[PDB]
Structures are given as structure tokens and as C-alpha cells.
Amino acid sequence: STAIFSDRYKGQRVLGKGSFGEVILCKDKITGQECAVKVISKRQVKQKTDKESLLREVQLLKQLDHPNIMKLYEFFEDKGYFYLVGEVYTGGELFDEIISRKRFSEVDAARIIRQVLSGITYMHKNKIVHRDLKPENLLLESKSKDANIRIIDFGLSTHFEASKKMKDKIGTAYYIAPEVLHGTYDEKCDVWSTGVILYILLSGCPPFNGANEYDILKKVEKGKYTFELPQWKKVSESAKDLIRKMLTYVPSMRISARDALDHEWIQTYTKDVPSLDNAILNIRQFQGTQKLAQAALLYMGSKLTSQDETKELTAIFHKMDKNGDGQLDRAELIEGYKELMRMKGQDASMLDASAVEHEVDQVLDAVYIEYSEFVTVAMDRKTLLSRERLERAFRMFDSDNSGKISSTELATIFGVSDVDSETWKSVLSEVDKNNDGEVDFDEFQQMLLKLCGN
Numbered sequence: 001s002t003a004i005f006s007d008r009y010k011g012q013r014v015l016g017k018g019s020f021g022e023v024i025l026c027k028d029k030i031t032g033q034e035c036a037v038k039v040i041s042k043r044q045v046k047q048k049t050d051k052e053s054l055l056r057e058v059q060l061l062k063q064l065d066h067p068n069i070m071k072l073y074e075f076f077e078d079k080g081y082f083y084l085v086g087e088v089y090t091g092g093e094l095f096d097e098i099i100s101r102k103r104f105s106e107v108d109a110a111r112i113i114r115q116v117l118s119g120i121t122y123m124h125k126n127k128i129v130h131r132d133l134k135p136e137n138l139l140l141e142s143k144s145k146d147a148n149i150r151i152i153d154f155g156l157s158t159h160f161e162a163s164k165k166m167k168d169k170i171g172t173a174y175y176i177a178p179e180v181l182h183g184t185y186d187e188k189c190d191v192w193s194t195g196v197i198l199y200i201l202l203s204g205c206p207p208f209n210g211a212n213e214y215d216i217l218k219k220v221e222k223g224k225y226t227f228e229l230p231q232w233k234k235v236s237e238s239a240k241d242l243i244r245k246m247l248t249y250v251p252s253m254r255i256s257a258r259d260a261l262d263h264e265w266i267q268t269y270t271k272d273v274p275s276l277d278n279a280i281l282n283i284r285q286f287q288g289t290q291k292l293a294q295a296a297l298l299y300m301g302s303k304l305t306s307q308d309e310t311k312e313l314t315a316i317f318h319k320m321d322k323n324g325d326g327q328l329d330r331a332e333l334i335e336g337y338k339e340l341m342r343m344k345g346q347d348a349s350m351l352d353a354s355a356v357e358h359e360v361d362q363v364l365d366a367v368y369i370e371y372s373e374f375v376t377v378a379m380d381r382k383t384l385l386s387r388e389r390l391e392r393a394f395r396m397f398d399s400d401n402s403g404k405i406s407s408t409e410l411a412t413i414f415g416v417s418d419v420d421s422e423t424w425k426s427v428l429s430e431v432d433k434n435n436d437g438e439v440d441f442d443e444f445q446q447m448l449l450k451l452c453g454n
């Protein structure tokens with residue numbers, strides 16, 4: 001008797017989109033235990049290993065235990081999906097918490113990096129490599145100031161192939177070890193990624209940077225970086241030495257995780273130190289830029305999904321409309337909405353028939369029934385979560401409350417989003433015919449619609 005995920009768990013709400021799938025906050029129907037479930041769609045994500053290889057890795061991961069590593073509880077599989085059930089953490093992404101503080105010292109950085117290295121060392125002892133370590137995979141356990149870091153996604157990348165879509169790729173290039181680019185890699189790739197993260201904590205800029213993804217990858221692959229930025233003048237020698245050893249090009253010459261834990265810098269600063277004010281400022285700029293580019297990509301995707309699902313839904317209902325009345329009942333709206341969830345594959349949110357009944361009932365309570373009006377409301381439902389996140393992200397990036405984003409800023413944003421320069425300028429030309437060389441929110445939004453075939 002294979003076991004079924006929704007026999008045990010009900011969905012509370014969506015937490016977000018992470019690597020390889022959606023993550024939903026769920027609750028055990030019997031014990032009331034809350035968990036975070038990552039749902040991997042087989043249609044969207046190809047496997048790299050056989051089933052046997054994956055089952056044994058899962059079995060090992062369920063037994064591992066370390067305070068800086070996400071705890072995995074269960075694994076389920078059906079026809080369309082894999083369901084990975086882990087512990088929920090509520091403190092959010094590390095960098096989002098850091099930009100909220102007024103001071104940040106080498107002691108704060110050292111304490112963070114010790115945690116990361118400790119998790120990594122443990123996982124490497126157990127022969128598991130992350131490969132895709134980056135700031136998004138570092139979660140704080142709770143919203144308290146002290147809270148431990150929990151690393152998510154250890155072990156995934158070995159069994160599943162990453163998306164080639166930019167909306168899923170944002171940020172990845174800064175942190176990937178050069179040997180991963182060329183194909184021969186081992187556990188030392190995780191030390192490199194940590195080194196890049198450390199460099200960024202102490203300066204607020206990527207050691208390997210550029211105007212688009214490929215430019216970044218080119219800097220990484222050559223492997224040269226410098227400490228010639230002004231803000232490095234305030235930083236201890238021992239920190240730069242540890243950095244150097246983690247960013248050592250040839251993996252066999254690069255320091256191990258375990259030895260980095262013993263480095264003088266970790267020893268000194270984790271047991272007369274200024275705030276790194278310039279680094280906090282750079283980090284909040286870095287962060288805001290990354291989050292706005294992500295928000296702009298998800299908005300464009302959400303718009304295209306809606307164009308696709310609106311027309312599909314209408315044709316399902318038209319077919320269903322026996323009498324040509326333009327009128328369906330509740331059971332019919334439910335069966336058509338279900339039909340949409342079968343064809344499509346988008347709503348981890350609609351785990352079972354019961355979540356679909358509730359969603360239908362929410363739309364009805366807002367709005368025999370005219371199906372064309374039901375279609376209108378059901379779809380806005382799914383967007384504005386992305387339209388209002390767009391707006392939130394624009395306001396967060398406009399830190400001066402100017403209401404405006406300059407041409408230069410757009411060039412940075414679209415570069416990170418990997419939208420071609422002559423393409424966005426062309427779209428900007430069609431909206432900015434006053435030559436202001438700056439845009440307000442509504443103008444920015446209009447550009448994005450034009451960049452996704454609207």
C-alpha cells in the first residue's frame with residue numbers, strides 16, 4: 001500500500017517558489033504538525049539519476065541531523081510529482097534580515113560563516129555536495145536576532161537538472177565554482193561558493209561581476225578578483241587570507257570546509273571592531289536590485305500564464321455549456337476548473353479536489369452562473385499576487401522615495417534580468433517620448449507588458 005501525500009497533509013498556503021518547484025506550508029491532518037513541502041513536477045524537472053539512486057539518497061537524508069541543515073521528514077511520489085516534506089522556518093532569507101540592521105561587523109560575518117561551514121563540513125563527511133549554495137538557500141530558523149541559519153536544498157542538484165529559465169536562474173552565476181562550469185567537480189565547489197558569500201558579506205559587492213549572466217560566468221571562469229575597493233581598507237588581514245584560500249582556483253589546492261573552521265579569522269572573531277557601514281549600504285542595493293529583477297520576471301511569467309489559462313478555461317466551459325445558455329452551475333464550474341488543473345500543471349496550491357472546491361467558492365463569494373464573469377475573477381486572483389509584489393519591489397528599490405527609476409538603474413535591472421539592451425530601450429522609447437530618461441511605476445509596468453507580447 002503505497003502512501004498518498006494528501007491523505008496525510010492539507011495545504012495551508014504557498015510559501016514561494018524555490019529551486020525545482022513550489023513550496024507549500026502544509027499541516028498533518030491527524031497530529032497538526034506544520035511542515036514546508038517542496039513539490040517537484042516531473043513534467044518540468046528532469047531526473048539525472050535512476051529511481052534507485054534517488055530512493056537511497058532520500059533514505060540517507062532522512063537520517064542526517066545537524067543544526068544548520070534543513071531537516072527532511074518524508075518523501076512521497078505519485079504519477080506527476082515528488083513531495084519533499086521538511087521542517088518550516090519562519091525567519092526568511094539571511095540577506096533580507098541583514099539589510100534591516102543598522103550595524104554589521106566582522107564578528108557578525110564570522111558567526112554567520114562559521115554556521116555555514118559547520119553544516120557543509122557535516123554534509124561532506126556524509127558524501128553530499130550542495131553545488132548551488134547561494135544566499136537564497138540560507139534561511140533563519142525564526143525571526144529572533146540570534147537565530148541559527150538553516151541551509152536548504154543540500155543534495156537536490158545531484159538528482160535533478162536545473163531550469164534553464166532566467167526567472168529560475170537569477171543570482172546563480174555569482175556563486176558557482178569554476179570547475180562546476182567545466183564538468184569535473186567535487187565537494188570543494190561548496191567552499192568556493194561560501195568564499196563568494198563571505199566576500200559579499202564584508203564588501204557588499206560580488207567578487208565576480210558583470211552586466212549580464214554570461215559576463216559574470218566569464219569572470220568566474222578566469223577566476224581573478226581583487227580587494228582594491230575602498231571598503232576593504234577597514235577589513236582584517238586574516239579575513240582576506242581566508243577568502244584567498246576559499247577562492248583558490250585549483251580545487252585540490254583550495255582549503256577544505258573543515259580546515260576553514262580552524263582558520264585564524266574564524267577563531268579570533270567568533271570568540272574594538274567597527275561597523276562595516278559601506279558594506280551594509282552596498283548589500284541593501286545589491287538585494288533590492290536582485291529582488292526587483294526577480295519580481296519583473298515573475299510578473300511577465302504570470303501575465304503569460306494568465307493569457308494561456310483564461311482562454312483554456314473559457315473553451316472548457318463553452319464545451320461544457322450544453323444549452324448554450326452561457327450558464328453553468330457550481331458542480332460544473334468545479335469540474336471545468338478541475339479540467340484546467342489536469343491539462344495545466346501550475347497549482348501545487350490545489351493539492352486535492354477539496355482545495356479546488358474552496359477556491360471556486362472564494363470566487364463565487366466575491367462575484368446557475370455566467371461562466372464568463374467567473375473566468376474574469378478566478379484569473380486576477382492569481383496575478384495580482386504578482387502585480388502587487390511587483391509594486392512592492394519597485395517601492396523597495398526606490399529608497400529615496402523619488403517615485404522614479406533612472407535609465408542607468410533600468411540598465412542594471414534589465415541586465416540582471418537578462419533582457420536585451422536594445423530590446424528594453426526600444427520598449428522604453430515607445431513609452432518615454434519626453435526623453436526624461438527615467439520612469440515611474442506605471443511606465444515601468446507598461447514596459448514589462450510590452451516585453452511579454454502585450
Ligand SMILES: CCOc1ccc2ccc(-c3nn(CC4CCNCC4)c4ncnc(N)c34)cc2c1
Pocket residue numbers: 015016017018023036037038061070072084085086087088089090093136137139152153154155156
Ligand atoms: C534535500 C533538500 O530538498 C528540500 C526538501 C524539502 C524542502 C522543503 C521546504 C523548503 C523550503 N523552501 N522554502 C521557501 C523558499 C521561499 C523563498 N526562497 C527561499 C525559501 C522554505 N521556507 C521555509 N521553510 C522551508 N523548509 C522552506 C525546501 C526544501 C528542500
